[PDB]
Design a protein around this ligand. Structure first.
Ligand SMILES: *Cc1cc2c(cc1C)Nc1c([nH]c(=O)[nH]c1=O)N2C[C@H](O)[C@H](O)[C@H](O)COP(=O)(O)OP(=O)(O)OC[C@H]1O[C@@H](n2cnc3c(N)ncnc32)[C@H](O)[C@@H]1O
Ligand SMILES: *Cc1cc2c(cc1C)Nc1c([nH]c(=O)[nH]c1=O)N2C[C@H](O)[C@H](O)[C@H](O)COP(=O)(O)OP(=O)(O)OC[C@H]1O[C@@H](n2cnc3c(N)ncnc32)[C@H](O)[C@@H]1O
Ligand SMILES: *Cc1cc2c(cc1C)Nc1c([nH]c(=O)[nH]c1=O)N2C[C@H](O)[C@H](O)[C@H](O)COP(=O)(O)OP(=O)(O)OC[C@H]1O[C@@H](n2cnc3c(N)ncnc32)[C@H](O)[C@@H]1O
Ligand SMILES: OC[C@H]1O[C@@H](O)[C@H](O)[C@@H](F)[C@@H]1O
Ligand SMILES: OC[C@H]1O[C@@H](O)[C@H](O)[C@@H](F)[C@@H]1O
Lengths: 576, 576, 90, 90
């Protein structure tokens, strides 16, 4: 570890790796710090789902997710256990136990919100859905020129899509995918468009998908190295970043204070530029720990000196969920083009079809897979091949259906996985609603209570705003119930429900972007630069100030590409 | 990858790595293949619990375990779901579905048995308890001379313990550990002795333990390298070993058939010595796929050509579990030496002790920690410090209580982790019974059903033997009830129970060791060589032919060490 | 004492549960945070569904209950009638 | 008076219940009192408890009793999963 770098990035998720990729490639001496460790295989910060074992045992991956999602704010527990032995030590009060937060009102929380501390961040476990936001969900980069605004966003998105390797044909020859996609397309013909979820992923084989991650964006190997001899990069895992030091004039950051978790020692790191990409919650924590905003329960009677909007206007999406069991009619349609020569198991059994026949309801790639399945496996009563990938269908947010949708199978299952019903029959439904930014909705940090890293404990003051947010959320639920029924009935144990506020992990607006600090109620400008400070930048979903339904990561990445263009224009790399 | 090695080892668990450590050390050219991949970070095959984050959020680690335990044999599911929508597709039978094994009798299973496919094997997640077996539990390595047998075991264990870095001092200054240990010592005074569970681990810091693993035994780095420029070792991950090829006379192995899972390519690898350390289930799977023992449902009318005892006499331990909530008396005794005045939270409150007083119940370090906790956290009603490590207590197996005991906190929790009761109060109790080896208890492999790697599907025919094993399992239950009540009453949700057969993962005797193939009904000799074959060696818990209650891994290692002594005596390494 | 209850012994528990009314039920503080945003939800754990705001949940006899029928609890009891020995007896 | 769902996979002929009842020391501090403001379903003052099992002999005996039940019951059989040894609600 050196003492001085051109650039220092806090956090090694995909947004920090965006800044790494742009600035390391542009010749800056870059240091990156993460509080978590390299745990993930030889490809540093790669997707954990990319092993042969998780791709043969994809029901198990939920365990990896759960194992690295740690709850942000757990209210004091009031459950009554009144069947302890009389000899056992027993509480007189509901006192603060097990890491809980006494500042947290249980009824105004985002109880599902969680954070991940591993190199690569949450991109080590994510679903990889990278849709663009349309105008209605997206903040303005240009004022007073819609066409120019769209042009700027299209340029940033096309880059971001390239970094992530976003694509929309990786599931094109999945039977289950097309079964679902075709039925919904038909059902909403002239009303709604359905397509594959855009995915940051590259298919390698018919049974393997290489899912994208922070590693894809930047490979996180220290530099110079053989393949990049003139670049300069160091990653320092197990380093808790604690405070950015402000000059007295509140115009420049002078250092970053770090705590090495292995040695236990503390250090002051100097940079020309400081970039915080520690996620929506922890970027906010790090700033409040540094004198930005207001530490403690909000007190309107005392304006903070800096960033009064910090941690207000936070948004989290409502999420509805269910699973369906494929209708008999749809399953029968899978085998419609087949010729079935008699009784299964017995000599009188050929399964054939006519390639290219114009009476055929399905393509030839579909019939050949069904044929070979029905012939290699004549005990099995379903026409869906055993290896066939899950659907990945969406109809994107529009004004007449203002929610995002993901239809298929997500690795994050929410209950014990059922085993009685054949898995090929099961389709998940997740609808995601947008939340109006409101000043009263707040993430703040205690001035007494601390977390397991000794930083001020985060505390939420959150309710879904009345009015449109709440109206839409319920309309969204009914839409899921109506649409899902076209495919099949609900699976008992996965009936239509709202998920725990915040489980969806799409928290935005904790350090929101705008043109003007005061009139837009924001903390950073459209360069992601913190108002008043020359050399401090913030990256991630915390930047997004709008009400959005779709998954925010590609959009945060686009914003980070723009911020890097500013940094490149205003700071010069040190000589090599 | 070469065609030709001195030694090939199949499996990179800690037994594999014992063979590599000995043979790579002695100058042999070694290759190891593992079906799974590297994913413990830059330390290949290291313990996944060695992150600062896991050791701060101890509850979370069970997810990692559950993530990489895949059930060996799941019977066909016959759960009735009769609340499907009438439009959903439903079969009219309980057909073979979702990977289940139609060979498996649900009533004669080890349903909790499971395997792990990752470089470092189960040592990447284990508990690291490494006790010796006493004579009663241990196979003979020398007959008719008890002193020479004790001497050989002592030598081999001692060597095993240096490999794993086993110790009994890492929890010595935990208040909770000492509280439980002292009370148990006092209560059974001169009927039973208690001590710390011997653990393969080194404490780094008051709040961090470096848990040992395969990596501790052998770092798994390709050699030659700057640290070992004369050594020759290559690891090949993502390689499924499928068959060993026998010569016509069944006196030697001629090659190893493998399948590179990333590329799809198949190869036959040549070696002088072939070592199988694929685990108790998979070593057997591979032998049977190579024409040892018998494929398919056991048929005593058709004797096997080779190794007639392969897969019979299997043992797996009974396990009984509860948790307790610490007694008021025990908790009050934590502060026995303190003078407490005034009222918590007021400026008049104080807590003090008399250092060195010979009438103090506890040592100065105890009293200092309690004092600082009670003075700094006057809102907390417990005298135990917040990061006190957990208890790690055992009373080892003896003839008058012939079960192993582990008292404390295990990372493998079995239910939802409860939050109402302060974790500082909770003590886990696991007692492990020994199971008599019986011929009728079998692991066999289907001749038609294959597993997710297209190998013969494992199937169990198992029941705890009547007579001694059963009598002891139920006496062991009563023993856990009786001892645990000395410390406190049962935690609701964790009441005294037998765990699922095989959940404990101490399967033994699948390829058991003995002096004589016929008279001892076994598969390998005391050099772990397969009878008949000059150059084929098996390693692991599969070898242990006795009824044991203690954790087997250290014992299997000690056998691997002896095996390597035989290899050094009978094969010469190739010149560098 | 019906032929049906002594043929279906498992079912009589329902009769017992049906006439045991809880004596003191503390205010409920279970958190249900998966309601639709359009549903009415109050801001506190207010006194709801017949609960008793005087009751400390941690110093209760939560299982205690009463029966208001002619014959009282002798309409459902187990009928066990031991004598007390001296130690137990006033 | 069964306490949970009735299990149907184990033949009811095998199943034996165990209930052990401890004695509780009478203590002035254990009280049943009635609210001067809250009323029950029949317009009468709401009953409220302030109870804990007394430390000392009551509590020691109760734990000794739970242990005795684990010891005695094992002479007849192992525990039925779902009805493991437990204290019931006060
Ligand atoms: C967990 C989850 C998340 C997402 C999906 C599903 C699952 C189950 N699916 C997904 C999501 N995003 C979408 O756009 N599409 C989808 O299909 N998920 C969210 C996505 O995963 C995040 O939006 C994205 O990674 C966030 O990127 P980031 O801003 O770079 O933040 P990360 O949380 O990934 O990484 C931050 C990082 O910094 C570290 N850290 C935290 N505090 C410190 C301090 N104080 N010092 C140093 N380092 C710090 C963390 O350790 C972490 O790596
Ligand atoms: C999972 C677990 C295990 C243990 C404890 C707790 C938990 C939850 N605690 C524990 C253990 N044992 C102890 O003595 N002490 C305790 O405190 N656990 C058991 C222990 O972990 C095992 O006994 C030990 O690893 C076995 O060592 P091994 O014989 O080297 O076998 P592994 O299963 O670790 O590794 C074998 C290995 O080979 C691979 N494989 C499997 N099949 C193939 C084929 N066909 N080709 C190539 N490679 C193969 C695996 O992927 C694996 O790595
Ligand atoms: C419910 C139950 C009870 C017993 C056991 C099993 C179960 C599930 N088994 C048991 C019993 N006791 C035995 O010694 N051995 C066993 O094997 N149980 C308890 C027993 O049932 C009670 O001890 C007994 O009936 C008490 O008799 P009681 O003192 O006569 O009181 P009851 O509660 O039976 O009847 C009182 C009664 O008067 C009424 N009432 C209440 N308030 C008013 C007012 N304000 N005005 C007029 N009447 C009032 C009730 O309606 C009731 O009928
Ligand atoms: O809860 C899982 C969901 O998590 C969200 O964070 C993702 O963006 C979705 F893709 C995913 O379906
Ligand atoms: O199931 C957990 C148990 O697993 C067994 O494999 C271990 O040996 C114990 F150490 C551990 O407590």
């Amino acid at each position: 570890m050196d003492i001085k770098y051109d650039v220092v990035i806090v956090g090694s998720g995909p947004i920090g790796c965006t800044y790494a990729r742009e600035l390391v490639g542009a010749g800056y001496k870059v240091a990156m710090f993460d509080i978590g460790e390299i745990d993930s295989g030889l490809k540093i910060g790669a997707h954990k789902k990319n092993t042969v074992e998780y791709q043969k045992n994809i029901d198990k991956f939920v365990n990896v997710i759960q194992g690295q999602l740690m709850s942000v704010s757990v209210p004091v527990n009031t459950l009554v256990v009144d069947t302890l032995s009389p000899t056992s030590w027993q509480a007189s009060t509901f006192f603060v136990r097990n890491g809980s937060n006494p500042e947290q009102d249980p009824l105004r929380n985002l109880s599902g919100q969680a954070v991940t501390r591993v190199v690569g961040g949450m991109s080590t476990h994510w679903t990889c859905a990278t849709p663009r936001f349309d105008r209605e969900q997206r903040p303005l980069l240009v004022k007073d020129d819609a066409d120019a605004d769209d042009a700027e966003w299209d340029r940033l998105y096309t880059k971001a899509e390239s970094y992530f390797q976003t694509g929309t044909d990786q599931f094109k020859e999945s039977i289950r995918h097309n079964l679902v996609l075709n039925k919904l397309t038909e059902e909403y013909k002239g009303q709604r468009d359905f397509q594959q979820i855009p995915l940051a992923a590259t298919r390698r084989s018919p049974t393997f998908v290489e899912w994208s991650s922070a590693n894809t964006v930047f490979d996180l190997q220290n530099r110079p190295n053989t393949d990049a001899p003139e670049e300069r990069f160091n990653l320092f895992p197990a380093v808790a970043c604690e405070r950015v030091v402000r000059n007295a004039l509140n115009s420049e950051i002078e250092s970053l204070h770090i705590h090495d978790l292995i040695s236990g020692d503390r250090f002051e790191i100097k940079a020309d530029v400081y970039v915080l990409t520690a996620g929506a919650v922890h970027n906010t924590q790090l700033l409040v720990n540094s004198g930005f905003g207001q530490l403690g329960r909000p007190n309107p009677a005392n304006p903070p000196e800096l960033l009064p909007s910090l941690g207000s206007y936070i948004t989290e999406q409502s999420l509805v969920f269910c699973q369906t069991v494929m209708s008999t009619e749809l399953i029968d349609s899978v085998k419609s083009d087949m010729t079935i020569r008699g009784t299964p198991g017995e000599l009188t059994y050929s399964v054939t079809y006519t390639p290219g026949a114009s009476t055929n309801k399905h393509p030839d790639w579909w019939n050949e897979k069904v044929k070979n399945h029905m012939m290699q496996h004549q005990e099995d009563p379903l026409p869906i091949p055993f290896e066939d990938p899950e659907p990945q269908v969406t109809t994107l947010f529009q004004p007449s259906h203002p929610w995002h949708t993901q239809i298929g199978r997500d690795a994050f299952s929410y209950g014990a996985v059922q085993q009685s019903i054949d898995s090929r029959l099961i389709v998940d439904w997740r609808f995601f609603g947008r939340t109006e930014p409101k000043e009263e909705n707040k993430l703040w940090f205690s001035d007494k209570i601390t977390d397991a890293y000794n930083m001020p404990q985060p505390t939420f003051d959150f309710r879904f705003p009345a009015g449109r947010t709440s109206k839409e959320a319920e309309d969204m639920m009914t839409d899921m119930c109506v649409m899902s029924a076209k495919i099949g009935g609900f699976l008992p144990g996965s009936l239509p429900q709202f998920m725990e506020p915040g489980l969806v992990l799409h928290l935005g607006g904790t350090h929101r972007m705008g043109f003007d600090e005061k009139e837009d109620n924001c903390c950073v400008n459209t360069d992601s630069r913190v108002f008043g400070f020359k050399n401090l930048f913030l990256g991630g979903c915390g930047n997004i100030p709008t009400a959005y339904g779709a998954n925010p990561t590609l959009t945060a990445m686009s914003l980070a590409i723009k911020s890097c263009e500013y940094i490149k224009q205003n700071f010069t790399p040190s000589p090599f």
